[PDB]
Structure formats: structure tokens, C-alpha cells
Design a protein around this ligand. Structure first.
Ligand SMILES: Nc1nc2c(ncn2[C@@H]2O[C@H](COP(=O)(O)OP(=O)(O)O)[C@@H](O)[C@H]2O)c(=O)[nH]1
Lengths: 49, 426
């Protein structure tokens, strides 16, 4: 049997198969307090002489 | 309680907002990161006049940045005391008024004004009450003179009873930058005369005069000129945050210096300003403050008051100092220079005392003087306005986006009769 000795649960581990390559979880840039979750960004400015 | 809302337009405005709020942070002990240090009660017992507590213990300015090109706001953000200002109070224009009054005012003064007055409404109505507005800008520029005046029009229409303080720097006759020079001056003047409460006249060649002749600087940068104005406009408002023996706010200044509501133009000065050559060699006494102040080498306007007549005056002192030497000096000027004061108003000046002197000086004084010497400034602007308006010069930049000939004719019509009514009280 592929089931358990005493009560009905499978015993032969499991056979998984993903559909796609499964990337791009879309890590959101906003936390539970929602600031922006800043990382060091770019200035779009003139040279700071 | 009462809060003064600072608005600053043009790149002269954005630089003057950085330098005025660092002398305010100097009095208040405001650390550049936003906190406070100093351990004294008198700064923070009126801190709501300029600063808003931001639920983190830091004090943010009530300052409204304003310009049509983002370069001059990058410089004031990167500079020291630049992280004090809230970034949402910065408004960004992209096209820019290139020294042009008309396109500063109408068609690149319209897409930004609906968001910057949204900022002003958000900031002023959030406070429980108002004391007035203080708009510092330039009248020889494009965006500080074009749409800086249009904000003045719309907040006056919306909020009529609140005071309209405005520090405005003017064209310099000797040094001529912004070569379309009198058009920006005159078009801003004939609006500002009937649509303001108090206009304080700054002129860059007068500030060069007080760096060279009394302060003994060799290389005066724009930072020193910006620092000199910040002396005066901090001393005008010194009683809104510090107590005194004879107290005076901005409405105090408006009700006394203005005999007729149409004329409200003043010469401004600060005392004392000397170099380290004569820093240790002079007594900081009350007669020494007023003898140095009542002259042509200390005014921030390029008009000699000896050529005219002081219609009204106001000396507003600072520091721990005796009250007899206030009024005795302010009456000795009348008994000596009697011909330099008008006859149909007795006791032409107003005294005030701020108990707290500025940083490092035991006693100072600011001065707001309504004279008829402003008139000789307006003739010296008008004689260059009509010299190049008769010959139709540079008017294709002024008629191609919304004006006509009638608005130009009304411009000198509304300031030459200002000149004529300055004659009648001379
Ligand atoms: N008082 C003062 N005047 C300035 C300063 N910088 C520029 N100006 C004057 O303003 C004029 C330039 O106008 P500008 O502000 O660049 O035009 P805008 O940016 O379109 O408003 C020049 O003629 C200067 O004399 C400053 O830091 N302080």
C-alpha cells in the first residue's frame, strides 16, 4: 500500500511538479508602514560644484 | 499661536530661503538634521511662529519653495541647512522663465500655481490661525517676478485680511544683468502697488555699497549679500518669538508706517555692520547704533534719503538696553535733522524693543522707513522702461503669449502717478 499502516494518510512522500520556472515574485517596495522602502537612488541634477 | 508663512520664489528666493532659515536656526538652536540644542526656554516658547512640530521632535520650516527650473533647488538641498525643508514644499518647474516677465506670469505661471497654492493651502489651513505671509523674491527675474507676483494676487484674493509682507530685490542701475531689465520691474510694480501691504526694497548695488564701505570686505560673494538681508528681515520680526518691554509685530509696522494705503514702500537697514578692524574699537551704545543707521551708507536701497523726506519711520531695537536712550535718540534725530522729516506728522517714528539680541551681539536695531526717496528709484527705472518701449524693443517676447499694448500702457500709467503722489508729500 501507498497509505499508512494504521490510519489513512499517504506514506510514500510525494511527487511534485512545478508548472513554470517560477521567478519574479514581485518584491514590493513598500513595507507594512509604507514609506517607500528606500534604497540609494540617482540625483538627476547638475554637477555639484 | 500665530504663524508667519514664508514663500520664496525665483532663484533669488530659493537662495534667500536657505540663508534666512539658517540665521533663524542660529537663534533657535536648530540642528541641521532637524533637532534642537541650546538649553534655553525662550526659543521654543514661541517656535510655532516659523516651525511646525513634526511628531518626531524635529522642527520643519513653514517655507514654500518656488522656481521654474530644478537646478536652484538642487543647490539649496545639497547645501548646509538644506535637509531642514520638507521636500513636498519644493515645487519643480521644468521649462523655466528665461528672464521673461510675461511667460513667467501667464502660461508658465499657470500649470504650477494650481499645485503650489495647493501646498500653501495645505500648510496654512493645517495651522490653527495665521498672522500673515512673507514672500521674498526678485523683480528683475523671470519666475520670481512673473508668477511670484501671481501667487501674491491669488492668496490676497483668497485671504484678504491677513498681512502681505514682501521683501523684493530690484533692478540694479549700475550693474545690468538680465538685459531685459525694466520690463520685469515695471510689469511687477503696477500689480504689487495695489495688491500688497508692505513692500521692502532691496537693491544689490546698495548691498555692494555696505560690503565695501562699512563692512570692509574684499570679495563679497552672493552669500554675504544674502546674509546681510537675513539680518534685517529677522530683526523686523524679532518680537513674534521673543518678549520685550515694548512689543511690535508686523501689523504694528503696517498700521504706523502707512499714512495712505497706496504708498507702502520702505527702506530697510540693519545695525551694526563693521569689520574686525573696528569691531573691538567701537562702543555698542544706543547713540552709536542710531548715528550709524541714519545715513546713506547703511540703507539697503540705492536712494539717498537726504534727497527726499522721511514721511514715517520705525526703529525696532534688540537686546538688554535702557528705554530712555531709545526715545531720546529717536527725538534727537527730529531736533537735529528737522528738515529731513515731514511737518504734518509729529513724532514720525515708532519704537519697539525685542529683549533677545541676535547671536553674538549684545544689542542691535532694525529700521523700516517710509520716505519719498523711493520716488527717485522709480524715475530711474522708468527712464529706462520708456527708452526701450518707445522703440518697440524686445516686445515680440512679450506679445506672443497673451498680452497686448494696453497692459503695457497701464504699467507706466500706474507707477508714474505713484511718482506724482510721492511729489505731493515732499
Ligand atoms: N539679493 C540677491 N540677488 C540676486 C542673487 N542672485 C541673483 N540675484 C539677482 O537676480 C538677478 C537674476 O534673476 P534670476 O533670479 O536668476 O531670474 P529668475 O530665476 O527667473 O527669477 C540678477 O540680476 C542678480 O543681480 C542673490 O543671491 N541675492
Amino acid at each position: 500500500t501507498s497509505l499508512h499502516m494504521s490510519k489513512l494518510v499517504p506514506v510514500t512522500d510525494l511527487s511534485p511538479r512545478p508548472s513554470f520556472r517560477y521567478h519574479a515574485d514581485t518584491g514590493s517596495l513598500d513595507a507594512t508602514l509604507l514609506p517607500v522602502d528606500a534604497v540609494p537612488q540617482e540625483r538627476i541634477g547638475r554637477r555639484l560644484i | 499661536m500665530r504663524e508667519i508663512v514664508h514663500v520664496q520664489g525665483g532663484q533669488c528666493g530659493n537662495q534667500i530661503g536657505a540663508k534666512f532659515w539658517e540665521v533663524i536656526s542660529d537663534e533657535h538652536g536648530i540642528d541641521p538634521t532637524g533637532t534642537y540644542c541650546g538649553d534655553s526656554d525662550l526659543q521654543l516658547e514661541r517656535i510655532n511662529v516659523f516651525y511646525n512640530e513634526a511628531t518626531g521632535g524635529r522642527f520643519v520650516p513653514r517655507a514654500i519653495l518656488m522656481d521654474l527650473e530644478p537646478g536652484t533647488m538642487d543647490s539649496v538641498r545639497a547645501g548646509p541647512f538644506g535637509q531642514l525643508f520638507r521636500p513636498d514644499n519644493f515645487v519643480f518647474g521644468q521649462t523655466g522663465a528665461g528672464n521673461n516677465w510675461a511667460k513667467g506670469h501667464y502660461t508658465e505661471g499657470a500649470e504650477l500655481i494650481d499645485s503650489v497654492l495647493d501646498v500653501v493651502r495645505k500648510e496654512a489651513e493645517g495651522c490653527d490661525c495665521l498672522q500673515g505671509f512673507q514672500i521674498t523674491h526678485s523683480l528683475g527675474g523671470g519666475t520670481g517676478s512673473g508668477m511670484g507676483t501671481l501667487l501674491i494676487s491669488k492668496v490676497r484674493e483668497e485671504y484678504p485680511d491677513r498681512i502681505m509682507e514682501t521683501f523684493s530685490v530690484f533692478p540694479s542701475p549700475k550693474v545690468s544683468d538680465t538685459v531685459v531689465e525694466p520690463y520685469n520691474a515695471t510689469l511687477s510694480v503696477h500689480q504689487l502697488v495695489e495688491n500688497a501691504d508692505e513692500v521692502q526694497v532691496i537693491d544689490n548695488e546698495a548691498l555692494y555699497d555696505i560690503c565695501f564701505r562699512t563692512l570692509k570686505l574684499t570679495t563679497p560673494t552672493y552669500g554675504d549679500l544674502n546674509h546681510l538681508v537675513s539680518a534685517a528681515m529677522s530683526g523686523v520680526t524679532c518680537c513674534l518669538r521673543f518678549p520685550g518691554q515694548l512689543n511690535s509685530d508686523l501689523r504694528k509696522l503696517a498700521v504706523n508706517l502707512i499714512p495712505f494705503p497706496r504708498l507702502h514702500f520702505f527702506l530697510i537697514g540693519f545695525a551694526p555692520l563693521t569689520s574686525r578692524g573696528s569691531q573691538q574699537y567701537r562702543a555698542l551704545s544706543v547713540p552709536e547704533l542710531t548715528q550709524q543707521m541714519f545715513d546713506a551708507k547703511n540703507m539697503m536701497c540705492a536712494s539717498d534719503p537726504r534727497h527726499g523726506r522721511y514721511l514715517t519711520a520705525s526703529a525696532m531695537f534688540r537686546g538688554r538696553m535702557s528705554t530712555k536712550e531709545v526715545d531720546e535718540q529717536m527725538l534727537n534725530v527730529q531736533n537735529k535733522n528737522s528738515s529731513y522729516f515731514v511737518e504734518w506728522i509729529p513724532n514720525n517714528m515708532k519704537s519697539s524693543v525685542c529683549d533677545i539680541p541676535p547671536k553674538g551681539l549684545k544689542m542691535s536695531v532694525t529700521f523700516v522707513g517710509n520716505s519719498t526717496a523711493i520716488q527717485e528709484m522709480f524715475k530711474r527705472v522708468s527712464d529706462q522702461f520708456t527708452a526701450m518701449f518707445r522703440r518697440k524693443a524686445f516686445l515680440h517676447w512679450y506679445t506672443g503669449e497673451g498680452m497686448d499694448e494696453m497692459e503695457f500702457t497701464e504699467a507706466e500709467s500706474n507707477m508714474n502717478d505713484l511718482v506724482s503722489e510721492y511729489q505731493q508729500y515732499q
